[PDB]
Amino acid sequence: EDALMVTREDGSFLIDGTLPIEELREVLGANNYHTLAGMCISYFGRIPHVGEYFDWAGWRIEIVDLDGARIDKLLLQRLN
Amino acid sequence: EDALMVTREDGSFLIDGTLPIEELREVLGANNYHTLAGMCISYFGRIPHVGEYFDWAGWRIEIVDLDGARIDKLLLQRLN
Ligand SMILES: [Ca+2]
Ligand SMILES: [Ca+2]
Ligand SMILES: [Ca+2]
C-alpha cells in the first residue's frame, strides 16, 4: 500500500497525515495528538485549507491535500 | 465538497487529478484523456510515483498525492 513518506527532487518531503509524531521526529532530526495530521488540527484548531502552513522545529509544514475532513498529505521543507 | 484547485503562497497551484483538461487549459492560459490525472497516466504509461513530474505547455506538473491508484493531487508551477 501507499508509501507514507517520499522525497522530492529538491530534498523536501511529502508525508502522509497518519505518520506518527515519534517517527516524524526521527526523520526530521527534530499530547492531544500522536500523528502529523493530529498536530495540524491541534495547531489550527480547525481543519486547515490546502496551502496553509506553520513552522515547527525548524521546518515548515504545509497542507497539500485534503480528502474531505482528512489531512491527507503534507509538504515538509527545512527552514532555509 | 473539496476545492478542485487552490493557489499556494508562491503562486503555484495545487490541483485535483479530476480537473478536466479544457478547464486546466483555461486556468493556465495554455485524446485518450480528458482530465489532468488522465494526462499523467498517458504521459508515464503507468501510475507515477509521488514526486515524478513532466513539463507541458510551459508548466511543470508534479504528482504530489496518490490514493491507491488514483492520482489525487498535482502541483503545477510555471517554468521559471
Ligand atoms: Ca484530495
Ligand atoms: Ca494519499
Ligand atoms: Ca489523497
Domain spans in chain B, listed from the N-terminal domain onward: 1-80
Count of CB atoms within 10 A of residue A30's CB?
13
Q: Hey, what's the cell of A42?
A: 491541534
Considering just the CA atoms, what is the radius of gyration of chain B in Å?
12
CA-wise closest residue to A65 among B37, B77, B12, B72: B72
Phi-psi region of B11 (alpha: psi -120 to 50; beta: other; left: phi over 0): left
Q: Identify whether the C-beta of residue A8 lies closer than 8 Å to the C-beta of residue A14.
A: yes
- Strand ranges across the sheet with A5-7: A5-7, A13-16, A70-78, A59-67, A53-56
- According to the annotation, is A4 in a ligand binding site? no
B53–A contact, CB cutoff 8 A: yes
Q: Please judge whether A72 and B75 are an interchain contact, meaning their C-beta atoms are less than 8 angstroms apart.
A: no
Distance CA A43, CA A38 (A): 9
Q: Which residues of B touch A3 (CB under 8 A)?
A: 49-50
DSSP A40: H
- Domain B1-80 fold: 3.30.465
DSSP A44: H
CA-wise closest residue to A65 among B20, B59, B14: B14
Q: Hey, what's the cell of A64?
A: 497539500
Helix (H, G, I), strand (E, B) or coil at B23: helix
Distance CA A10, CA B74 (A): 16
- According to the annotation, is B16 in a ligand binding site? no
Q: How was this structure determined?
A: X-ray
Torsion over CA: A59, A24, A8, A75 (sign): negative
- According to the annotation, is B65 in a ligand binding site? yes
The position carrying cell 515538509 is: A76
- Strand ranges across the sheet with B5-7: B5-7, B13-16, B70-78, B59-67, B53-56
Helix (H, G, I), strand (E, B) or coil at A74: strand
Q: What is the bridge-based pairing of β-strands A13-16 and A53-56?
A: unpaired
The position carrying cell 515519534 is: A22
**CA–centroid distance, residue B48 to ligand 1 (Å):** 17
Beta bridge partners of B67: B70
A67–B contact, CB cutoff 8 A: yes
DSSP B2: -
Establish, for the pair of chains A and B, how many residue pairs have beta carbons separated by less than 8 Å: 53
Q: Hey, what's the cell of A43?
A: 495547531
Phi, psi of B27 (to 5 degrees): -75, -20
Half-sphere exposure of B11 (CA within 13 A, CB side): 5
Distance CA A17, CA A69 (A): 12
B7–A contact, CB cutoff 8 A: yes
